[PDB]
Amino acid sequence: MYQLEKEPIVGAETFYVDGAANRETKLGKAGYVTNRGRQKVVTLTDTTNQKTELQAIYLALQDSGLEVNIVTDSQYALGIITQWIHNWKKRGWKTPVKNVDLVNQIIEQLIKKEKVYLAWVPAHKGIGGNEQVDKLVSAGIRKV
Ligand SMILES: NCCc1ccc(O)c(-c2c(O)c(O)c3c(c2O)C(=O)c2c(cc(O)c(C(=O)O)c2C(=O)O)C3=O)c1
Ligand SMILES: [Mn+2]
Ligand SMILES: [Mn+2]
Numbered sequence: 001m002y003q004l005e006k007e008p009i010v011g012a013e014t015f016y017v018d019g020a021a022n023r024e025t026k027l028g029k030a031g032y033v034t035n036r037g038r039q040k041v042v043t044l045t046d047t048t049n050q051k052t053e054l055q056a057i058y059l060a061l062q063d064s065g066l067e068v069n070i071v072t073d074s075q076y077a078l079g080i081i082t083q084w085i086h087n088w089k090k091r092g093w094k095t096p097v098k099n100v101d102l103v104n105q106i107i108e109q110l111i112k113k114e115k116v117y118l119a120w121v122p123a124h125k126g127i128g129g130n131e132q133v134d135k136l137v138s139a140g141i142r143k144v
């Protein structure tokens, strides 16, 4: 229904989102850091790594203005969201089984926006945004 931006929205605040979970305890964290100096980290129970990545995106949509840049390192989160947008009101579309409720909450937030840019980056070493939020969500969840 929607058109995600082809390139970052110049001027808009950028949310570097991430999540991490531990399979053995199902504990996890999801959150963001932004280039305007905000951050947020929430602790979650009964969750998975995929669920935490989606939850971080939901948090960024909840806390942002009408134009938002979001940078994720979850290929899954980006793919399931983009596929939802491209295939609604379209033939031959079976909605995914896993995480359907969370993705529906995200799409809810997405359509309320004016412009959204969503990009995937591989996780990497450094001092940039994806690295910072990685350390935040990995604290006490997985070794780094
Ligand atoms: N110092 C460099 C190595 C390093 C150090 C610290 C890190 O935290 C990570 C690291 C992440 O922080 C991270 O969040 C992720 C990964 C990382 O490797 C992934 O690899 C990864 C992630 C999400 C995904 O959805 C996939 C998928 O969907 O397939 C993959 C995939 O591997 O395939 C993902 O979220 C990597
Ligand atoms: Mn990640
Ligand atoms: Mn990461």
Ligand SMILES: [Zn+2]
Residues within 6 Å of the ligand: 066, 067, 114
């Ligand atoms: Zn606007």
Ligand SMILES: [Zn+2]
Residues within 6 Å of the ligand: 124, 126, 127, 128, 129, 130, 131
């Ligand atoms: Zn970086």
